């Protein structure tokens, strides 16, 4: 079980990742719980910053995005100059 | 090369499918062109009506959704009592 911190500088426009999941999308048959990184762009900030496809997003700038809805997660990622993500890689 | 017509009765609320692609999402690396069915619900109207995962949506009630944007396709599917889809299964 691994847990990593990703430092993505914000205000850089395109980030280079894609997310799925949420505490509401766990009903319509992801089968595991949580938000997950589904794509990392080759030249993406998230890819070079360490973020990998499959990483569950546990926290965003201190927030506990874990067990949050999909749109809650999108909002938590868009609103925050310094993007501090805590992600899981189990 | 196959082309099928799917008759989905509208005004039935949840349809039971999911779409991807578009004439604008062909840039950020689907690699083929067009809109595609990515999920068909087990009890879904689209599943029982014949729609399969992988089917490209060529037309919606006569429209040529082919080579259309993702949101153009969503709108073309949501706006129309009788949903007439022409889809490809190649």
């Amino acid at each position: 079980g691994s847990v990593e911190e990703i430092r993505l500088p914000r205000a850089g426009g395109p980030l280079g990742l894609s997310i799925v999941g949420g505490s509401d999308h766990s009903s319509h048959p992801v089968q595991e719980p949580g938000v997950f990184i589904s794509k990392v762009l080759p030249r993406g900030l998230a890819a070079r910053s360490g973020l990998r496809v499959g990483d569950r997003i546990l926290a965003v700038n201190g927030q506990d995005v874990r067990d949050a809805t999909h749109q809650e997660a999108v909002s938590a990622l868009l609103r925050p100059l310094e993007l501090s993500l805590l992600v899981r890689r189990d | 090369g196959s082309v099928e017509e799917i008759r989905l009765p509208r005004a039935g609320g949840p349809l039971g499918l999911s779409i991807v692609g578009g004439s604008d999402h062909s840039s950020h690396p689907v690699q083929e062109p067009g809109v595609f069915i990515s999920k068909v619900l087990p009890r879904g109207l689209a599943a029982r009506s014949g729609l399969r995962v992988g089917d490209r949506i060529l037309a919606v009630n006569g429209q040529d959704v082919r080579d259309a944007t993702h949101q153009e396709a969503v709108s073309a599917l949501l706006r129309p009592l009788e949903l007439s889809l022409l889809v490809r299964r190649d």
């Binding site: 997310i19 794509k39 999108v74 990622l77 | 950020h28």
Partner: peptide, 8 residues
Amino acid sequence: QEEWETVM
């Protein structure tokens, strides 16, 4: 009519 995947 529900975002199942969001790119950023």
